[PDB]
Write a protein that binds this ligand. Structure first.
Ligand SMILES: Nc1ncnc2c1ncn2[C@@H]1O[C@H](COP(=O)(O)OP(=O)(O)O)[C@@H](O)[C@H]1O
Ligand SMILES: [Ca+2]
Lengths: 375, 68, 116
């Protein structure tokens, strides 16, 4: 546009595909990372079904679709279907050719080595990308919120990651990975829903569970005191008319499921709560470096949007943590797009040149170019 | 005689959708008044809660100074 | 600093009027333009004070000198409060259609004075 040339920003997860044009502050066309076929055989003739039904077109009509998700936190059940997800991204919504503008993707911390080389194969050899990089999830948001000294816990629907990044990344481990977010809460509901004459059976309607979840479901401050309150039918049940037509008086259902977050013992996992793992990462660093970590805590992700998420942390942490200085948690009121706001940062930096992979660089160091320069 | 039936039938359709619409519209109009009243009521309570927690903000502050 | 001995204030104004009238800016048009400038002055004179909304040491932004921020919305003739709901607080949604403004973020002081 008579400014520069070849530039773009992108970001994908287990919820939405955040992307936009060149030099933007916020996304432009986010869409669900879904994709399925036809369990209904799509009037076979009222088109040769194909196109699994990805994008707004897919999210619009769920019934015909057997929504089979490709990338469940880390593991990619299949790469063949990924081919026609990015074919919908750059060409339909972004309206730009990938054989021109760079690309800034996100990296699920500690992702299988074999996956990186496989992805690069899809871009460089097929979609011809002469410049691109895959930054590491959390570290991005750090520079956006305006923090240089804090501990980041960025996670939404993908995977939980405790990234203590306030003066260095890639160093002692002090990081954790937990497959317990988003889809885990989306699949657990139908189970407990059975006791209330409800059952979102198939995957298509399972996706709706998440929709209603993010508009009412809240977290209990103390399950004990709210157990006796159950008698008082006022703060619990609330009339929610299902778009089709079937009221669901969610009440105790709201604060029962989220309890699993702090208590992973409800789904057969010894994984400690997100406030225990926090200790595990802090106890590794030096002794004279905790007082500043407690001062500011970066809690990001769409998972940190439900009522009663930050106040609970300040109750459990103080217990098994030093009690002398003040403790404050920085949870950006809109901390979901924290990664994208940070993506816009690195997207406009020139120092970033010493990170991405140039067309020729791949052929000069084989497929291992990724893990030979990056880390 | 047949044309009469066509128009007479339309009268039944018109009368049916009229009484049905007006019936629900009246019910809706009455409901709005109840919801509007609840809005005004809740808004009033929220105002009292807002001014109260603000009074605690200046109270917890002055107490912190005296404690220091 | 305001009053200066070197430059005459009252003597220049009448000369400025001549310059505007000579070119093609009659008083009728001048007044119509001053409203636009005067509006900015109202939205200018507002360096908000400390907003004790946070807990520890940090803070956000809130109006204490209301009549000043009110003047900003006075020329606009809109809900003084609603005005600050969209500015001091950054609202973003987007996706599918295009954006829906209401839910927002109380930004820090640096970004606050920045937007100011
Ligand atoms: N205000 C909100 N309240 C509750 N859930 C929200 C809110 N905003 C976004 N979400 C949800 O957060 C999820 C996306 O979070 P995100 O951190 O981007 O996930 P991921 O990185 O795993 O793709 C989606 O399930 C979305 O519905
Ligand atoms: Ca992710």
């Amino acid at each position: 546009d008579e400014d520069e040339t070849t530039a773009l920003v992108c970001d994908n997860g287990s919820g939405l595909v955040k992307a936009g044009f060149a030099g933007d502050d916020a996304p432009r066309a986010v869409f669900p990372s879904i994709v399925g076929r036809p369990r209904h055989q799509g009037v076979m003739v009222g088109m040769g079904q194909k196109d699994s039904y990805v994008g707004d077109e897919a999210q619009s009509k769920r019934g015909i679709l057997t929504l089979k998700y490709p990338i469940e936190h880390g593991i990619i059940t299949n790469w063949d279907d990924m081919e026609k997800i990015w074919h919908h991204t750059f060409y339909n919504e972004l309206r730009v050719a990938p054989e021109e503008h760079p690309t800034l993707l996100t990296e699920a911390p500690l992702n299988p080595k074999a996956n990186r080389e496989k992805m690069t194969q899809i871009m460089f050899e097929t979609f011809n990308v002469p410049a691109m990089y895959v930054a590491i999830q959390a570290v991005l948001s750090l520079y956006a919120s305006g923090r240089t000294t804090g501990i980041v816990l960025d996670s939404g629907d993908g995977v939980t990651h405790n990234v203590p990044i306030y003066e260095g990344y890639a160093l002692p481990h002090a990081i954790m990975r937990l497959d317990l977010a988003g889809r885990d809460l989306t699949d657990y509901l139908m189970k407990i829903l059975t006791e209330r004459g409800y059952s979102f059976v198939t995957t298509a309607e399972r996706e709706i569970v998440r929709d209603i979840k993010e508009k009412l479901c809240y977290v209990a401050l103390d399950f004990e005191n709210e157990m006796a309150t159950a008698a008082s039918s006022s703060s619990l049940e609330k009339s929610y008319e299902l778009p089709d037509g079937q009221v669901i008086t969610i009440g105790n259902e709201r604060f029962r499921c989220p309890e699993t977050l702090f208590q992973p013992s409800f789904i057969g996992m010894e994984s400690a709560g997100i406030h225990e793992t926090t200790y595990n990462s802090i106890m590794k660093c030096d002794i004279d470096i905790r007082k500043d970590l407690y001062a500011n805590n970066v809690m990001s992700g769409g998972t940190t949007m439900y009522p009663g998420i930050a106040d609970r942390m300040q109750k459990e942490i103080t217990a098994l943590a030093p009690s002398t200085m003040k403790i404050k948690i920085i949870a950006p009121p809109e901390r979901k797009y924290s990664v994208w706001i940070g993506g816009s940062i690195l997207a406009s930096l020139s120092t970033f040149q010493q990170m991405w992979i140039t067309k020729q660089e791949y052929d000069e160091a084989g497929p291992s170019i990724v893990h030979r320069k990056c880390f | 005689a047949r044309k009469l039936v066509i128009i007479e039938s339309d009268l039944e359709r018109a009368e049916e959708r009229a009484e049905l619409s007006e019936g629900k519209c009246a019910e809706l109009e009455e409901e709005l008044k109840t919801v509007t009243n609840n809005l005004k009521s809740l808004e009033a309570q929220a105002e009292k809660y807002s001014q109260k927690e603000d009074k605690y903000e200046e109270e917890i502050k002055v107490l912190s100074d005296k404690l220091k | 600093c305001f009053d200066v001995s070197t430059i005459d204030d009252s003597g220049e104004f009448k000369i400025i009027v001549k310059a505007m009238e000579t070119l093609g800016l009659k008083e009728s048009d001048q007044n119509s333009i001053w409203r636009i400038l005067a509006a900015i002055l109202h939205i200018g004179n507002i360096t908000f004070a400390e907003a004790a909304e946070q807990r520890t040491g940090t803070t956000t932004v809130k109006v204490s000198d209301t009549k000043s921020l009110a003047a900003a919305a006075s020329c606009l003739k809109t809900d003084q409060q609603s005005l600050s709901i969209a500015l001091c607080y950054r609202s973003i949604s987007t996706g599918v259609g295009k954006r829906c403004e209401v839910i927002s973020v109380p930004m820090d002081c640096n970004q606050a004075a920045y937007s100011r």
